[PDB]
C-alpha cells in the first residue's frame, strides 16, 4: 500500500511520431502533461484549464474523463518509448478512476479536483459522450498490452475489463426503446432530454460502444441501430471550379468530426471518407485566409470559452437557420487534429502559424486561441493538448483499439456499424 510517488518530469513518445519538420514543437505541446505543469500532483489527472503569463501557471481545479483518456493513451506511448515511470502512472490513474464516484457505472462530468480527490460537479451529470470516449481509450490501453505476458500488464488488462463491465447498467439505462437511440445521459437523477442522434458529432463513440459491451446480454442487447439510424448530413458546395460535399458538425466545430479518429481508423472504416476530406479542406482554406488556425470549440482570446465553428460547415446554420457559433477565432488543436486526414499540410500550417505568431509558444504548450487579427488567449487546455498530441499518435492508438476489438469479438460489429456512416 505504501509506495514511492514517481515524478514524471520527462515525457517522450517514440521517434516515429515526431515529424523531422516539427519535432521540438510537438515536444513543447506534449510537455503540457509533465507533472507540475498541466498535471495535478495530488489527483494525478490533468487540469482542465491553465493560464500562463511568463512560464508561470494558474490552474482551474477541474478535470473530465475525456482529458484523462487522452492522458492515458499518451502515457501508454511514453511506456512504449521505454519510460518505466509511465507504467506506474497508468496504474495510479486507473486507481483514481476506480475510486471516482459513478452512476450506474458511468463517470461524471466534470470532476472537481479541489480537495485532492475527484468530486462530481454540482450538476451530478453523467454524459454518454465522456463515457464513450473513455471506453475507447481503455480499449486502446488494453489493446496495447493484450500480448504481454508481463503480469503487471495482465493486471491492467483485467482491471480495464472489470471497469467497462461495470458500465453495463449505465449503458442499459441510456437505451430508449421507443426512439431507438441513446439518451444523452443523466443529470441530477433524471434522463437528459436529448438523444445521441448524429453520427457527425463527438457522442458517436458512445452509440458505437453500447451495442458492443451489451452484445452478450441476449434479449436486452442494445441494437446496432442506436448507431446506424443516427443521421448524417452534408451540403454540396462549389469553389474555383471544384466540388466539395462537407459533413456538417452541429456547431461547425472541427473537433466533432475528428476527435473519434484518435481512437478509430475512420478513414478506412467509413465507406466514403471524402466528406471528411472536404470538411477538412474547407477548414484549411478558411484558416489560411484568415491567418489563423482551424476552428473548433476552444478558449477565447480574452480567456472565456466558446464553441467555435464555421457557419457554412455547421448543420444548425445550413439545415435549420440557427447560427450557434462564430468563426472569429481558430485553435491549434483543430489544425493538429487535421494531421489525421492530411499530415503534411497540417505541419506546414502549424509551422506557418508559429512563424506569424512566435509568441504562441510557451513551455506548457501553444496557447489555445488565436484571432484573425492576431490576438491570443492566455488559456491552455488539457482537452486541446490531448487532442493535439493524440492526433500525432492516432495511427498507434487506432491499431491498439483494433487489436482490442479483434480480441473481444467486436471488430466485425464496428465495421458493420461503419457501413451505415453515409450521407443521408
Residue numbers in the entry: 20 to 443
Pull text from the paper:
β‐1,2‐Glucans are natural glucose polymers produced by bacteria and play important physiological roles, including as symbiotic or pathogenic factors and in osmoregulation. Glycoside hydrolase (GH) families related to β‐1,2‐glucan metabolism (GH144, GH162, and GH189) have recently been created by identification of two β‐1,2‐glucanases and a β‐1,2‐glucanotransferase, respectively. Structural analysis of the proteins in Groups 1–4 revealed that they possess (α/α)6‐barrel folds similar to those of GH144, GH162, and GH189 enzymes. Overall, phylogenetic, biochemical, and structural analyses revealed that Groups 1–3 are new GH families, GH192, GH193, and GH194, respectively, and that the three families belong to clan GH‐S (clan GH, classification based on structural similarity) as GH144 and GH162.
